[PDB]
């Protein structure tokens, strides 16, 4: 280890620069934290613009029968498109079809 030397007489570049870095990963796992966006009501059997933990989309919502395991949040089709989701407030499983 080598010692930094920081004094106020140092010019730009030699001055200390505080750095904060975020190493977050997204949307291949259940969400846990995000901003102040407010939750709305839940509607079914209607083509709607849903938004579950940052995942926008468009389609009708229907209660599916797929058993999502507790570490699992999203269900995917063959083409890697989302197919079913667990509502973050009610832990029921809902089918999503455009």
């Amino acid at each position: 280890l080598q010692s930094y030397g920081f004094q106020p007489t140092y010019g730009v570049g030699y001055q200390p620069y505080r750095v904060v870095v975020l190493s977050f990963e997204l949307l291949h796992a259940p969400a846990t934290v995000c901003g102040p966006k407010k939750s709305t009501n839940l509607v079914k059997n209607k083509c709607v613009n849903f938004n579950f933990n940052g995942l926008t989309g468009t389609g009708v919502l229907t209660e599916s029968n797929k058993k999502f395991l507790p570490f699992q949040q999203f269900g995917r089709d063959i083409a890697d498109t989302t197919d079913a989701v667990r509502d973050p407030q009610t832990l029921e499983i809902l089918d999503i079809t455009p």
Binding site: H28, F68, Q72, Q73, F74, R76
Partner: peptide, 11 residues
């Protein structure tokens, strides 16, 4: 083990 935290079936 499970490679990813995503649910899949019949695939």
């Amino acid at each position: 083990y499970y490679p990813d935290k995503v649910f899949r079936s019949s695939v």
